[PDB]
Write a protein that binds this DNA or RNA. Structure first.
Ligand SMILES: OC[C@H]1O[C@@H](n2cnc3c(N[C@@H]4CCc5ccccc54)ncnc32)[C@H](O)[C@@H]1O
Ligand SMILES: [K+]
Ligand SMILES: [K+]
Length: 546
DNA sequence: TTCAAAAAGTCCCA
DNA sequence: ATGGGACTTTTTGA
């Protein structure tokens, strides 16, 4: 339940909020960690504060109560007035209390402002100058359902649907940050692009000035943790310019301890820096350099259609228990299943550019099983081996589905037709024409072209441009970066891809057909495909004027 | 009735 | 062991 932030990042975040604090003008800064754990951030805040007071102790002594400002009194003053922390874990607070106490070697006891509580429910009696830390990340599946009711009712401005718990910590931190205060936190990066984070992005943009965003993309910041990180620094200062510094990593393979400090890494060639006008952020935050922005805007202005305009999108089958319904095509159990019940089944790894690998699995479309007495053998010997787990699906407990039915079987006729399929998570654009009525789970998305757009766009033309290097770069500008070399390819962004028709349509389509013809050969010469792709990329770059 | 989003991913190996 | 790569289920709110 407790996660250790790397020391190099903790030091950076504390320095970010405190390095320019005028301790002479305000010797009572309130610094808060809203989920402080064992005190990774707060113990470093202590050290930074102690040097700050000690370096200026005589100036404080002269300006203020000279009996109060002595070096021997710095420890007590820091704990009474400056350091605040809250965490749900009682043991961690106890350890942090000891660590703060042991900063100096009984006299009258010193009150330490540490609270064991739910920070999202605490009645905070005052605002804070500086707020730092690493909040909990809990998504919609791992969050207890009784708690979501409170979040949906009290944090509705940032928390709906598939939002994350750390959205609410952003809201709490902002709300209790003083005027002129500064906050700096490390959270997942996904809210920067995700559909769920739209409301949170709106809340940040209109309530604070975002000073800086450090985007680590798919780098592994937390050892043995499958998460992708970013650092946000923001303030409530009266400013006029409100430009954001964006530091975006260039190589996801770096080990974070390259230098003694993080700011050395940010200035190095391992990162790129650029500025974004906060006032120009739409509901989407497009955080790219001027070359990429110029590139993105050209494509948007040139393309008159989007995929959503011309296509019908849908998510794949969700059986609710794949082991009950999915069998290898050579499994002897399939002799028990009438072939009218069997569908070809593919995984995301089966989707290549332009074409799908031949399927090795079969789906039992159990929705078409009329009743339990007529296909008893299928139920008793195949599906019923998982009857307990099948019965625990939500729609079976409510009686909407029979225990042997697919949870979300969708419409068969959507799959049993010519269509385009693509993996839900990939390192690159992989859009394939499906000729074989393939079904799939939710790791593969599909679409088909609307009837009224068939005479403007063909499937062969679409996989041509969509698989091109231009469109690979174009999609990744705004795509959701998930983990190292993985982007989400979900309809909420894939269907926003814009497309064009011009004089190059026929040659692009013809090149795509040549590629498809070679790829479907037995003795395929993969080499010529790459040359045809290079030729097609040139046509597309000519078409879009890049 | 029934859509689609969600990585403190998950699991394996050298 | 740890770090790094291949690959991706079904729960869930709306
Ligand atoms: O993971 C980083 C650190 O965050 C701490 N942490 C976790 N959840 C909280 C929290 N409220 C949450 C909101 C949802 C909920 C439900 C039940 C109980 C608590 C809470 N408030 C303060 N600290 C909290 C952990 O202990 C860890 O050291
Ligand atoms: K004085
Ligand atoms: K990562």
């Amino acid at each position: 339940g407790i996660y250790y932030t790397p020391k190099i990042i903790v030091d950076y975040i504390v320095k970010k909020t405190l390095k320019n604090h005028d301790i002479i003008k305000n010797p009572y800064p309130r610094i808060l960690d809203i989920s402080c754990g064992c005190g990774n951030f707060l113990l470093e805040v202590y050290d930074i504060l102690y040097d700050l007071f000690e370096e200026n102790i005589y100036e404080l002594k002269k300006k203020y109560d000279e009996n109060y400002w002595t070096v021997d009194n710095i420890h007590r003053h820091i704990l009474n007035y400056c350091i605040y922390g809250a965490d749900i874990d009682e043991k961690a607070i106890s350890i942090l209390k000891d660590s703060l106490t042991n900063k100096k070697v009984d006299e009258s006891d010193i009150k330490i402002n540490l609270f064991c509580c739910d920070s999202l429910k605490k009645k905070w009696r005052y605002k804070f100058d500086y707020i730092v830390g690493n909040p909990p990340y809990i998504g919609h599946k791992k969050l207890e359902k009784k708690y979501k009711k409170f979040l949906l009712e009290k944090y509705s401005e940032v928390y709906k649907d598939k939002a994350d718990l750390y959205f609410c910590f952003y809201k709490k931190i902002i709300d209790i940050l003083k005027q002129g205060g500064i906050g700096s936190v490390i959270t997942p990066r996904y809210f920067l692009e995700s559909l769920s984070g739209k409301d949170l992005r709106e809340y940040i943009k209109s309530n604070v000035n975002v000073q800086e965003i450090v985007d680590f993309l798919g780098a592994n910041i937390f050892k043995n943790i499958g998460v992708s990180s970013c650092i946000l620094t923001f303030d409530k200062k009266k400013t006029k310019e409100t430009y954001i510094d964006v530091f975006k990593i260039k190589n996801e393979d770096i080990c974070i301890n390259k230098f003694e400090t993080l700011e050395e890494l940010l200035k190095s060639s391992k990162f790129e820096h650029f500025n974004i006008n906060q006032r120009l952020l739409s509901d989407e935050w497009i955080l790219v350099n001027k070359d990429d922005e110029t590139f993105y805007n050209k494509i948007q202005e040139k393309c008159k259609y989007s995929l959503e305009d011309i296509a019908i999108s849908f998510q794949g089958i969700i059986t609710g228990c794949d082991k009950a319904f999915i069998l290898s095509k050579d499994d002897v159990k399939l002799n028990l299943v009438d072939d009218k019940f069997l569908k070809c089944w593919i995984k995301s790894k089966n989707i290549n550019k332009y074409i799908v690998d031949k399927s090795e699995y079969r789906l039992i479309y159990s929705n078409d099983i009329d009743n339990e007495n007529t296909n008893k053998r299928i139920l008793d010997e195949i599906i019923g081996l998982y009857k307990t787990k099948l019965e625990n699906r939500r729609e079976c407990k409510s009686g909407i589905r029979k225990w042997y039915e697919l949870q979300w079987g969708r419409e068969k006729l959507f799959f049993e037709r010519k269509k385009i399929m693509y993996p839900y998570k990939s390192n690159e654009n992989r859009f394939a024409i499906d000729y074989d009525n393939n079904f799939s789970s939710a790791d593969v998305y599909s679409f088909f072209i609307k009837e009224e757009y068939l005479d403007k766009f063909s499937y062969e033309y679409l996989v041509g441009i969509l698989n091109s290097s231009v469109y690979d770069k174009y999609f990744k500008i705004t795509a959701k970066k998930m983990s190292k070399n993985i982007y989400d390819y979900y309809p909420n962004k894939v269907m926003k891809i814009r497309i064009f028709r011009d004089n190059n349509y026929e040659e692009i389509e013809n090149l795509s057909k040549q590629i498809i013809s070679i790829l479907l050969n037995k003795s395929i010469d993969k080499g010529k495909v790459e040359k045809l792709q290079i030729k097609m990329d040139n046509l597309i770059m000519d078409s879009l004027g890049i």
